[PDB]
Amino acid sequence: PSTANGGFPSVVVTAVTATTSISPDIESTWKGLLAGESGIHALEDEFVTKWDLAVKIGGHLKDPVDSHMGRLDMRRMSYVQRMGKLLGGQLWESAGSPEVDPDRFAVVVGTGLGGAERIVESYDLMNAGGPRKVSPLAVQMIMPNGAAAVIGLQLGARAGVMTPVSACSSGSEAIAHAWRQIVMGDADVAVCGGVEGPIEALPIAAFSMMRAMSTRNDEPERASRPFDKDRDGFVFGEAGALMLIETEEHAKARGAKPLARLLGAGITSDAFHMVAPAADGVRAGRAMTRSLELAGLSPADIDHVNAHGTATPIGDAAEANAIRVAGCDQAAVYAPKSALGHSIGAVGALESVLTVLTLRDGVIPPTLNYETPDPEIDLDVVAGEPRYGDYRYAVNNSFGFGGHNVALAFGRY
């Protein structure tokens, strides 16, 4: 059973929303990427000077989430819940505020951590003034399912509200499980994607101490160099992203105009190391292969790979091997983290949206900062200018610390 042979129902993407370091408007982010814009800047936050952080670069959201939040929302929600509410509302408006069957409507939203700032706040409040100073709302704000739960309540989804956690692949895994919920017949429509917290001193310290992060502070826009010989780790770029998926029949019935098809999803694991990806890229490649099996595609059908491409030395080398294992090494490769940086639990969802726009508009943006090819990579990296083409099929790659591999197969509508 496959999408191609009608074993699974046809599933279409009918709306997308994202907030990024370039714009709060996904169409403006898209136009900016195609024009070679970067969201990465010098961090002006006082915490950089306070701690003299080795990393002094990153992409804050162009439009901060809390500029849209009233006093009640600031008191009763964690940051990722506030981001979830904002994007959920925007997505539903973009979809024409459809009246769907709540009992056939699912939400699947991944995140890296959850309402972690409310853990440290509760800890500090209790140490200061005892247990009665902890908010009655602490549990519902902290719990990592909090963002999915807020969006489910907001939009009226009664066919399941789910939160997969797999670190940097959480946002893609959410879209994978939303696809599974529809093709298994539990839902006809799903809001899915990923949200993530902002750049702060403790997050920078934790990832910096792994030596995972770029310290090219003198030239912030040149720091994120996926697949480049001179890469030195990832750059934080804040983001959140949701898409609306539904059966082709459901979309047709309400006169929704599909952006793309979601054809298949592959989830595998390395069982190799807690943070290092498997050097051979075999299980990562097999995630890509599994997405093709469920789609009913061959590797020769794949015109485009949206790479995980974090710009770590070991990460990009492993992914180049994975793309070869999957037989997709003739595909045009884009690494959006070159321009938008790394949003951890959100980034797979953001890159899924970018993959949909590539197929909709028949264009791949340039991988920024790709100036010196690495002999170990040997990929067709899109660079210098956007690449226009009749792109029919694309795979979005997303890999997570812990050895989690998620590949999503998309088709042009």
Question: Residue 132 is which amino acid?
Answer: R
DSSP string, 191-250: EEEE--PPP-HHHHHHHHTTT-B---TTSGGGS--TTBTT---B-BB--EEEEEEEEHHH
User: Between the CA of residue 246 and those of 94, 266, 281, what are the distances in Å?
Assistant: 15, 19, 32
Distance CA 142, CA 349 (A): 22
Select the residue whose beta carbon is closest to ligand O6Z and give its number: 197
Q: Any idea which residues carry the catalytic annotation?
A: 168, 308, 342
114 versus 299: smaller Cβ distance to its own copies: 114
Contact assessment for residue 193 and residue 13, using Cβ atoms and an 8 Å cutoff: no
Distance CA 278, CA 172 (A): 20
Q: Is 68 annotated as a binding residue?
A: no
Distance CA 159, CA 181 (A): 9
Contacts with ligand O6Z, residue ranges (CB under 6 A)? 79, 112-113, 116-117, 196-200, 203, 236, 238, 343-344
Residues 176-215 that bind its own copies (CB under 8 A): 177, 180-181, 184, 186, 201-202, 204-211
Assigned token pair, 334? 């884009």
User: Between the CA of residue 208 and those of 56, 61, 316, 367, what are the distances in Å?
Assistant: 11, 21, 18, 24
Distance CA 170, CA 164 (A): 6
Provide, rounded to whole angstroms, the least separation between the CB of residue 288 and ligand O6Z: 25
142 versus 359: smaller Cβ distance to ligand O6Z: 142
Q: Which stretch binds its own copies (CB under 8 A): 12-20, 120-128, 324-332, 384-392?
A: 120-128
HSE-CB of 36 using CA atoms within 13 angstroms: 10
128 binds its own copies (CB under 8 A): no
Residues 139-158 that bind its own copies (CB under 8 A): 139-140, 142-146, 148-150, 152-153, 155-158
Among its own copies, Na ion, ligand O6Z, none, what does residue 351 contact (CB within 5–8 Å per kind)? Answer: Na ion
272 binds its own copies (CB under 8 A): yes
Q: Is 273 annotated as a binding residue?
A: no
Provide, rounded to whole angstroms, the least separation between the CB of residue 166 and its own copies: 5
Bridge pairing between strands 260-269 and 240-247: unpaired
- Choice from 166, 247, 312, 321 touching its own copies (CB under 8 A): 166
Using CB under 8 A as the binding criterion, the count of chain residues that bind its own copies stands at: 82
Provide, rounded to whole angstroms, the least separation between the CB of residue 236 and ligand O6Z: 4
117 versus 303: smaller Cβ distance to ligand O6Z: 117
- Residue 236 pairs in a beta bridge with 342
403 binds its own copies (CB under 8 A): yes
Residues 63-102 that bind its own copies (CB under 8 A): 102
Contact assessment for residue 189 and residue 100, using Cβ atoms and an 8 Å cutoff: yes
Distance CA 55, CA 212 (A): 11
Residues 341-360 that bind its own copies (CB under 8 A): none
112 versus 411: smaller Cβ distance to ligand O6Z: 112
Provide, rounded to whole angstroms, the least separation between the CB of residue 208 and ligand O6Z: 11
Among ligand O6Z, Na ion, its own copies, none, what does residue 343 contact (CB within 5–8 Å per kind)? Answer: ligand O6Z
Instruction: Give the number of other Cβ atoms within 10 Å of residue 388's Cβ.
Output: 11
Provide, rounded to whole angstroms, the least separation between the CB of residue 395 and ligand O6Z: 24
Contacts with Na ion, residue ranges (CB under 5 A)? 306, 351, 396-397
Extract the annotated binding site for substrate. 308, 342
Extract the annotated binding site. 308, 342
